[PDB]
Design a protein around this ligand. Structure first.
Ligand SMILES: CC(C)[C@H](O)[C@@H](O)C(=O)NP(=O)(O)O[C@@H]1C[C@H](O)[C@H](n2cnc3c(NP(=O)(O)O[C@@H]4[C@@H](O)[C@H](O)[C@@H](CO)O[C@H]4O)ncnc32)O1
Length: 490
């Protein structure tokens, strides 16, 4: 076969599937690992956005009650080291020890905050395991199809520890691990024992090319087969080449900017709300995205299904109100830093430049502070910063509760003093079934989020890739790359 060469925007700090949840991690861990349930993005001729759930490591599954789903596992599946996958590896994957228990915080910092209210799994036999929650939860199924639920080998994982495992991953996926050089590359090779639609590449290299211009020059050279994290501003040049083309889709993710609310200037919602009210998203969508970005009506997305509100109003744009709020705040005109890891997010630096001018017009002075990967300063040294959230469930629970809820990093690490009402509705939605009460609680949470402005939603980016026309691969509507039945050459 042919070795696949990818020019990427970045690499994760770990290949441990939960510690790799990011914009740059899933495109690699999707190859090394498998989930029990998988999403079939290409079902019924869909352009990589189908929401269909198909069996993967679990040949079948059945909800027993409001707290548990029994999985019947595929037999003779092998981990990359020849160890057979059993219900024991599945129990360990979702165990208190490895993922949601108090001890797990040390190994997987965000594991507990991103997990459901789990109870210990029950192994029925070598190929049957029941995944359980201590309280009623109809979210088990979407969680098991997610980036939180890639299956790890119990013995090898325990032998190495979560940290050492992140540097030498072992999974059941189509590509086995070969090498990980931090700040340089990840090399994978075909797992010809995949259970499993056969890998079509002999090797895959994820090479960091932090500058998008060097990434485009690389594809034209051509040092790469496919490049990631481009901007619609690159579309005309790449598409003029006869052997090159762009492939892009709107993904189930939103770009945003957030604050360190532990800082004096961001303790009260007034200056956060003023900055949010001056963000002119429609011009940013023209200037930078060429109409290829979607401004959502709040923390509300179609993939939420029954908890998506299609009648919700757009987020407010009000420069006069923003001006008044800056005057009403204790802000004195002192510069505020906004940290960004270059263009890790597409259009991050041109978006900040545009917003800096919008903010200067309402009386706020924002300065760009750029930083290299691995050099993010202590929390204490940061004020504003960009971020993104992948909506990883077919429900509104993610990501408002895992990220912005009472037990999340935005309140616990970044200092958001959320109102009591916001945290009460977070608990209610987690345990209430779908209905009038749960739909309304999410809307009231969305209304609270906009007034509080702990983060400011910008848009759903159109994820732009560029590839050699002789590399047949289609983007999916998520921050990952899929090669199963979606990769061929010539
Ligand atoms: C281990 C330490 C001892 C060590 O020194 C070092 O590793 C360190 O500094 N660690 P620290 O904790 O300070 O991590 C730093 C702190 C800072 O906030 C930054 N950051 C966090 N999420 C990031 C991200 N998310 P993303 O947008 O690509 O991916 C998101 C993901 O964050 C999110 O959880 C998920 C679901 O909403 O959506 C993805 O889209 N993209 C780029 N930067 C990110 O990394």
């Amino acid at each position: 076969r042919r070795a696949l060469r990818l020019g990427v925007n970045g690499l994760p700090n770990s290949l441990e599937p939960v510690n790799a949840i990011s914009n740059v991690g899933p495109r690699i861990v999707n190859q090394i690992f498998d989930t029990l349930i998988a999403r079939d993005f290409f079902a019924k001729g869909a352009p990589g956005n189908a929401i269909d759930l198909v069996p993967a490591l679990a040949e079948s599954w059945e909800r027993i009650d409001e707290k548990s789903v029994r999985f019947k596992l595929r037999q003779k599946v092998m981990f990359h080291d020849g160890v057979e996958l059993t219900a024991d590896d599945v129990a360990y994957t979702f165990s208190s020890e490895r993922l949601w228990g108090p001890e797990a915080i040390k190994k997987i910092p965000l594991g507990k905050s991103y997990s459901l209210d789990f109870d210990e799994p029950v192994v029925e036999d070598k190929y049957t395991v029941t995944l359980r929650t201590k309280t009623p939860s109809y979210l088990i199924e979407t969680f098991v199809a997610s980036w939180m639920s890639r299956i790890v080998p119990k013995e090898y994982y325990k032998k190495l520890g979560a940290v050492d495992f992140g540097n030498k991953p072992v999974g059941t996926g189509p590509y086995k691990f070969v090498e990980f050089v931090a700040g340089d590359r990840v090399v994978l090779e075909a797992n010809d024992a995949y259970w499993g639609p056969k890998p079509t590449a002999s090797k895959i290299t994820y090479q960091i090319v932090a500058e998008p211009a060097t990434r485009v020059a690389g594809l034209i050279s051509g040092e790469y087969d496919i490049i990631t994290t481009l901007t619609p501003d690159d579309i005309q040049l790449i598409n003029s080449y006869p052997d090159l083309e762009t492939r892009g889709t709107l993904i189930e993710n939103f770009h945003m900017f957030t604050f360190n609310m532990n800082q004096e200037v961001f303790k009260d919602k007034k200056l956060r709300r003023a900055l949010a009210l001056a963000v002119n998203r429609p011009i940013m969508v023209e200037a930078l995205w060429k109409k290829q970005a979607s401004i959502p009506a709040g923390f509300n997305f179609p993939n939420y299904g029954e908890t998506f509100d299609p009648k919700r109003k757009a987020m407010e744009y009000n420069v006069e109100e923003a001006k008044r709020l800056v005057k009403e705040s204790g802000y004195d005109g002192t510069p505020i830093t906004y940290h960004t890891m270059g263009n890790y997010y597409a259009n991050a630096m041109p978006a900040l430049m545009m917003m800096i001018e919008m903010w200067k017009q309402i009386g706020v002075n924002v300065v760009m502070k750029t930083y290299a990967p691995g050099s993010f300063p202590p929390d204490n040294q940061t004020w504003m910063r960009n971020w993104s959230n992948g909506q990883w469930m077919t429900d509104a629970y993610a990501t408002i509760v895992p990220e912005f809820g009472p037990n999340g990093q935005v309140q616990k690490r970044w200092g958001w003093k959320a109102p009591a009402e916001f945290n009460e509705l977070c608990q209610k939605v987690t345990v209430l079934p779908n209905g009038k009460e749960r739909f309304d609680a999410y809307n009231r949470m969305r209304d609270i989020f906009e007034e509080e402005a702990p983060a400011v939603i910008l848009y759903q980016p159109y994820d732009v890739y560029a590839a050699r026309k002789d590399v047949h691969w289609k983007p999916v509507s998520f921050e990952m790359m899929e090669f199963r039945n979606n990769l061929s050459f010539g």
